[PDB]
């Protein structure tokens, strides 16, 4: 019929919730700046030479040079000590010039990484190559390996020179 | 009609005073206190920002915010702390990075 | 696309019942206000407050204001809608009376006309969308197209209490 159990309680909640909807709309907004304004600031900081920062290719993010250096090492860590420089553009979503501008540091600073032909190779990678290579020596031609690992002879030799033992 | 160089200049005085007292200024209230169209008040303030006579930002809704140099510094540090940060994580952060009052 | 972001933040509704369900309408209305409150709080928390709203005592009539910002200026329009009998299956029709005549994407009465994409999506989500989702996916996107366009066609003009 006309009454249903709970109807009163239900409309009491609507009396409450409707008053909340008004209170909520009368409340002041948490203030934020436009994204344009955030860019405006960063552009000044750059002018005043108070900040060095690069933008992503989609123009949605900012990244410092140091963070690039760091994310470069991260990919190396992930990829296992051999990474191609060209793939870091996509990985970091920055132009390659910004990556290329950090290579000097990566090598000199860490001292743990070297550069071969558009690719960065580190101590670890080599240490683990050597292992596999011992697994031929005690069981069985750099010529061949250079071809097996697509690595220049000059390099691999010098690197193999300081491993034996 | 258009503002005598004299009148133009009580504009800037009014404006400085509002900034000194409130830091954040709603440009429709400035326009009303000086008797200008929000339109023309905003455009005037755009020229001042271009002149370097004034330092600040107008949000997308037409409120003016002066940012202090210590703020600019904090923004720089905050970007450097984060290393990578989105413009929208910035806009979010601005509520705490910036004072909205004196 | 972008939709997903706004959608995700709004709570879904559950009760499939409209104004003439003696027993279940009030439960649908509870869900309506709750979602609405949450959308407004969300809108305030980001600095994005673009409307005001009120209902009749039964939640069958709704009326209020919205505003759009274009080139740093604010344009404010009154709005209203009646809940259909076939709600929540049938979506309510929002009217901005002040633009009647002035925009092609609108029927007589001020009844705005949405894209072809709206109806199919509303329908495949029945009964989860409600008024918050109406505001978010219907009116707002409609303003984001029509208002800029009418401004650049000189069909509308900013209004200050005033004179140059």
Residue numbers in the entry:
A (entry chain A): -5 to 134, 138 to 162
B (entry chain B): 205 to 306
C (entry chain C): 4 to 167
Sentences copied from the publication:
Stalled ribosomes at the endoplasmic reticulum (ER) are covalently modified with the ubiquitin-like protein UFM1 on the 60S ribosomal subunit protein RPL26 (also known as uL24). In a pathway analogous to ubiquitin and other UBLs, post-translational attachment of UFM1 to the lysine residues of target proteins, UFMylation, is catalysed by an enzymatic cascade of E1 (UBA5), E2 (UFC1) and E3 (UFL1) enzymes. Collectively, we identify a fundamental role for UREL in dissociating 60S subunits from the SEC61 translocon and the basis for UFMylation in regulating protein homeostasis at the ER.
We determined the crystal structure of a minimal region of UFL1–UFBP1 that is stable and catalytically competent (E3mUU(ΔUFIM)) in a complex with UFC1. Comparison of the cryo-EM and crystal structure shows that UFL1 WH1 and WH2 superimpose well with a root mean squared deviation of 0.98 Å. The composite pWH–pWH′ domain and UFBP1 WH1′ show almost identical folds in the two structures. Moreover, the crystal structure reveals an N-terminal helix (α1) of UFL1, which is connected to pWH through a hinge. Importantly, this helix mediates multiple hydrophobic interactions with UFC1 α2. Single point mutations in UFC1 (L32R, I40R) or UFL1 (I8R, F15R, Q19R) designed to disrupt this helical interface abolish complex formation between UFC1 and E3mUU(ΔUFIM) and impact ribosome UFMylation without altering the association between UFL1 and UFBP1 in E3mUU(ΔUFIM). While UFL1 α1 binds to UFC1 in the crystal structure, no clear density is visible for UFL1 α1 in the cryo-EM structure. As the composite pWH–pWH′ domain adopts a similar conformation in our structures, it suggests that the hinge region that connects UFL1 pWH and α1 is flexible and enables UFL1 α1 to adopt multiple conformations to optimally position UFC1–UFM1 for catalysis. In the E3mUU(ΔUFIM)–UFC1 crystal structure, UFC1 Asp50 interacts with Arg265 of the DDRGK motif in UFBP1 WH1′. Although the UFC1(D50A) or UFBP1(R265A) mutations do not disrupt complex formation between UFC1 and E3mUU(ΔUFIM), these mutants impair both aminolysis and ribosome UFMylation.
